[PDB]
Write a protein that binds this ligand. Structure first.
Ligand SMILES: [Fe+2]
Ligand SMILES: [Fe+2]
Length: 174
């Protein structure tokens, strides 16, 4: 049967979930227990962590504008997600999404990761660019598997300390 239910109007769904598409929640997954992880991400939200996804990520910036801070070819780059833009991110490209605008909405589509295929989350030194800390996770649920990871980095000067220049990373806000 239709495990994930009947078709429904997407703009209306987004409107009805507007209260979840802003802090502190910020995002909302559309269907549960599906292979395709379909999420709408709102704003505002700024962050310092970079994601290393072992699979591809599809973006369609439906409302408002956002941007991804990236590492490409060993250098810091920015991919703008202007309203109306689509984008396909290859596996393992490190990315830190920034969503400055309230009322923005981005469709993000990913795949469930098989057992053994791990996600990485990491931070880089603002002073010398060296990797400061990386955690790998078997990502089953973003809601329980991810916030403690971030929280543990912010709470530890050891985790935040650059091994190259010794600068302590700011933590939650750059
Ligand atoms: Fe990601
Ligand atoms: Fe450093």
């Amino acid at each position: 049967m239709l495990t994930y239910g009947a078709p429904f109007n997407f703009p209306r769904w987004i409107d009805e979930h507007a209260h979840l598409l802003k802090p502190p929640v910020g995002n909302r997954q559309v269907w549960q227990d599906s292979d395709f992880i379909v999420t709408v991400v709102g704003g505002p939200n700024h962050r310092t962590d970079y994601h290393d996804d072992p699979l591809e990520e599809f973006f369609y910036q439906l409302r408002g504008n956002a941007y991804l801070n990236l590492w490409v070819d060993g250098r810091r780059e920015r991919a703008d997600l202007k309203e109306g833009d689509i984008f396909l991110l290859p596996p393992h490209v490190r990315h830190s999404p920034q969503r400055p605008e309230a009322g923005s909405a981005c469709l993000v589509i990913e795949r469930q990761r098989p057992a053994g295929m791990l996600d990485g989350f990491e931070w880089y030194c603002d002073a010398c660019g060296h990797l400061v800390h990386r955690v790998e996770v078997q990502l089953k649920s973003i809601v329980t598997d991810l916030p403690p990871l971030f929280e543990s980095f912010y709470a530890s000067e050891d985790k935040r300390r650059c091994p190259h220049c010794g600068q302590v990373h700011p933590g939650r806000a750059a």
